[PDB]
Design an enzyme around this catalytic site. Structure first.
Site, PDB file in Angstrom:
ATOM      1  N   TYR B  34       0.975  -1.188  -0.207  1.00  0.00           N
ATOM      2  CA  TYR B  34      -0.060   0.182   0.016  1.00  0.00           C
ATOM      3  C   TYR B  34       0.766   1.259  -0.023  1.00  0.00           C
ATOM      4  O   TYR B  34       2.022   1.205  -0.516  1.00  0.00           O
ATOM      5  CB  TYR B  34      -0.806  -0.025   1.166  1.00  0.00           C
ATOM      6  CG  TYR B  34      -2.283   0.592   0.861  1.00  0.00           C
ATOM      7  CD1 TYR B  34      -3.062  -0.279  -0.012  1.00  0.00           C
ATOM      8  CD2 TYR B  34      -2.966   1.415   1.636  1.00  0.00           C
ATOM      9  CE1 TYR B  34      -4.554   0.447  -0.470  1.00  0.00           C
ATOM     10  CE2 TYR B  34      -4.087   1.997   1.343  1.00  0.00           C
ATOM     11  CZ  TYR B  34      -5.033   1.394   0.214  1.00  0.00           C
ATOM     12  OH  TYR B  34      -6.181   2.021   0.079  1.00  0.00           O
ATOM     13  N   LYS B  89     -17.150 -22.229 -12.504  1.00  0.00           N
ATOM     14  CA  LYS B  89     -16.234 -22.101 -13.678  1.00  0.00           C
ATOM     15  C   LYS B  89     -15.021 -21.500 -13.453  1.00  0.00           C
ATOM     16  O   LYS B  89     -14.115 -21.712 -13.994  1.00  0.00           O
ATOM     17  CB  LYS B  89     -17.368 -21.118 -14.641  1.00  0.00           C
ATOM     18  CG  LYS B  89     -17.381 -21.863 -16.020  1.00  0.00           C
ATOM     19  CD  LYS B  89     -16.289 -21.784 -16.818  1.00  0.00           C
ATOM     20  CE  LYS B  89     -16.022 -22.546 -18.127  1.00  0.00           C
ATOM     21  NZ  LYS B  89     -17.406 -22.362 -18.859  1.00  0.00           N
TER      22      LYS B  89
HETATM   23 MG   LIG Z   1      -8.096   5.544  -1.146  1.00  0.00          MG
END
Ligand SMILES: [Mg+2]
Ligand SMILES: NC(=O)c1ccc[n+]([C@@H]2O[C@H](COP(=O)([O-])OP(=O)(O)OC[C@H]3O[C@@H](n4cnc5c(N)ncnc54)[C@H](O)[C@@H]3O)[C@@H](O)[C@H]2O)c1
Ligand SMILES: NC(=O)c1ccc[n+]([C@@H]2O[C@H](COP(=O)([O-])OP(=O)(O)OC[C@H]3O[C@@H](n4cnc5c(N)ncnc54)[C@H](O)[C@@H]3O)[C@@H](O)[C@H]2O)c1
Ligand SMILES: [Mg+2]
Lengths: 387, 387
Positions: B34, B89
């Site tokens: 992040y 699937k």
């Molecule tokens: Mg954000």
């Protein structure tokens, strides 16, 4: 480090993979994970449509939906370029609160189109996390989908922000022995995150909050408020103050900046009330350094920085918010559930261990998702907002 | 067994989960999965937009998109009830050809809306697998998205069907020593799968194919063809035959039924040419039993059944089709790539080991995805349809 990040993404072509939750290598199990087996839960769901939630991933699956139009501090850069962020957000749902998450990046800046499109693909998602969208656009979309969809919809960059902010505020007031119903707050930047902090404070019976934009504070009859700014002018700045941040900051208990770098000085902190609380959450360069903040006389300083003593971190709220929300089968993430997510977070810290450097927990503390979830869950069941 | 299937789905609340492809437990790696790490590939993709394919899951991710309007043999039952099939699937993409897949179920029966909506969420998908949609609707959508999107789009229930069918046909002709440019074929049911088998045979220079619907064969000037039926009336039934299946089956080398149960008899098989080839792929009750088929004189019988000696199985083609398609960075799944997927499949069987009970491989044979991929890849690179 840049190269370290880029390498990481390149290493495995993304952070997000899918696994099978059941095993299949032959034909036996095959006819159960597929035909004619799959027919049997399909007919269940056809008979009782709520049975989605027992033969399907749905109730543990949160969609991470975006636009690209507000990516971190990179702003409008499109659906492709936002993808790594969305993938990153999904695996944090997974790693922090054991949640299955999947990123959807939408190529449209039309609110109505985005509303409709997300509403039409809700079948697979137990909740919606909206991420990295433009203020004011993000509000109407959030609002439209919130009144349209029967599942929880949640814009983290604004509501998730406010939870951690309000948590850090409540904790900071205990420190300087002040109560939030007596204090005068100033918030710089009437964008998404500013907007929503205002809401979560008024949700907490704040005495007075003043919103300030890149042009001056917002009062009744200001030239050009967006539609949500207008609605907020009604509830905020009771005493109807006007003017620039310099003038307006004078006398306030709390400054909360979600706007720009280096627009606040030490002189400006000297004008605020005794035991000043300063929140410089602009990133990466906050609107003021804690050094210059404590130099002005700030008793408490929070920033959005990991190196600095009091980090407002978004990963504090959203994993636990969705956890209890899902754990409860909530149909909705209401205001009281936000309110409860705040207190739980503020109470990770014992009250016997509060400091001017201990207003917020650590962003990885496993006891944070647990408690925020229990409180988010507890109020969902109580209030009724539950399947 | 029913309960065994239902239990399986209930057991883990779905077959599809998400994992993290990278590790993260602390703050160090956190700032790489992040912020501020994710910023770095985001800016790459912003600079060179193709860089999606190196910092992102995209190029190994296939979307499984549906309507609910044609679910197995359950037909129009909606997006919720189709979800277990779509999840099923996805994990077959994973287990058979190591592909990351994710199910999107769309709540709209409007072609244009579905086109637009899928085209707008293509950012995360390296390819599109369309699944369980209504003929004729499925065709215009497939066609619209195919000319709109820069990634491969593929309707498995029709094109994937034809690959296995054409594979089983070519193998069956070697048996009875006939060539496909000399033979007269009849296909019962001018729906999706019928339609597409016709295409894949004409793709193979069949001498003559006749399509028959629940009302009679299709010829120029038939009352009410759908738009794709009309286009197919031009290429098919050269000799312009008219009438019922009984009359029309008379003299044909190959019957291929994708329509109904028990509409063909042993008497009817006696009218077909010597060394008859009978394909009764209707499910679960084929349009005729192999017993009554061999009683009529059928040399070769294929069905859609696992218990019976010659199974047309859809999981034969699609995993290997997408594998090479992805393995090649194909921008497209062209007709010649289909053609190549057929031959590769037909050639898993040595030609020294062909029988009247050995026209198709086993549906789990790992050497099937491998070879179908290499051939699908080989022609993608050759033809140019590649990034
Ligand atoms: Mg954000
Ligand atoms: N946990 C956290 O640390 C956290 C969470 C959310 C946002 N933030 C930070 O706060 C900032 C705002 O983020 P956002 O999501 O609200 O973005 P945003 O663009 O929605 O908010 C910015 C708003 O502030 C106003 N503004 C801009 N420059 C200004 C100036 N010099 N003076 C006064 N007002 C100004 C603009 O009207 C704009 O609408 C970002 O820099 C972000 O890093 C931090
Ligand atoms: N690998 C396989 O075994 C495989 C693959 C695809 C389809 N199938 C089977 O083939 C059948 C068709 O599947 P589909 O996807 O084409 O469905 P579909 O509904 O698109 O095809 C059916 C079409 O056949 C026609 N039809 C229906 N009843 C008929 C009758 N009595 N006589 C003549 N025509 C008739 C209708 O016009 C209809 O459009 C299904 O039952 C399915 O199980 C098998
Ligand atoms: Mg299907």
């Amino acid at each position: 480090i840049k190269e370290k990040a880029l390498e990481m993404h390149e290493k495995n072509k993304g952070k997000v993979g899918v696994v099978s939750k059941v095993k299949v290598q032959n034909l036996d199990d095959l006819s159960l994970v597929y035909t004619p087996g799959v027919a049997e839960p399909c007919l269940k769901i056809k008979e009782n449509p709520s049975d989605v939630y027992r033969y399907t991933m749905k109730g543990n699956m949160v969609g991470v939906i975006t636009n690209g139009t507000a990516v971190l501090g990179l702003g409008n850069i499109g659906p492709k370029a936002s993808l790594p962020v969305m993938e990153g957000k999904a695996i944090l749902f997974k790693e922090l609160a054991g949640i299955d998450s999947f990123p959807i990046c939408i190529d449209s800046t039309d609110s109505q189109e985005i509303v409709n499109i997300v509403s039409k693909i809700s079948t697979v998602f137990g909740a919606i996390n909206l991420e990295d969208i433009k203020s004011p656009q993000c509000i109407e979309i959030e609002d439209a989908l919130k009144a349209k969809l029967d599942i929880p919809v949640f814009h983290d960059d604004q509501h998730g922000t406010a939870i951690v902010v309000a948590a850090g505020i409540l904790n900071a007031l205990k420190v300087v022995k002040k109560s939030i119903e007596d204090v005068q707050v100033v918030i710089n930047g009437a964008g998404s995150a500013g907007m929503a902090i205002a809401k979560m404070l008024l949700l907490l019976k704040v005495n007075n909050v003043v919103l300030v934009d890149k042009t001056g504070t917002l009062y009744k009859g200001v030239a050009n408020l967006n539609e949500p700014q207008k609605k907020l002018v009604e509830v905020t700045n009771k005493y109807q103050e006007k003017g620039t941040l310099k003038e307006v900051l004078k006398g306030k208990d709390i400054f909360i900046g979600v706007s720009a770098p280096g627009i606040v000085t030490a002189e400006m902190v000297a004008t605020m009330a005794k035991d000043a609380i300063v929140f410089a959450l602009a990133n990466p360069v906050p609107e003021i350094m804690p050094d210059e903040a404590k130099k002005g006389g700030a008793r408490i300083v929070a920033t959005g920085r990991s190196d600095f003593p009091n980090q407002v971190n978004n990963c504090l709220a959203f994993p636990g918010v969705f956890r209890g929300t899902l754990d409860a089968k909530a149909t909705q993430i209401t205001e009281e559930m936000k309110k409860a997510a705040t207190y739980a977070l503020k109470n990770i810290i014992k009250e016997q261990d509060l400091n001017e450097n201990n207003i917020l927990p650590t962003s990885f503390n496993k006891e944070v998702v647990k408690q925020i979830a229990l409180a988010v869950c507890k109020v969902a069941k109580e209030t009724g907002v539950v399947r």
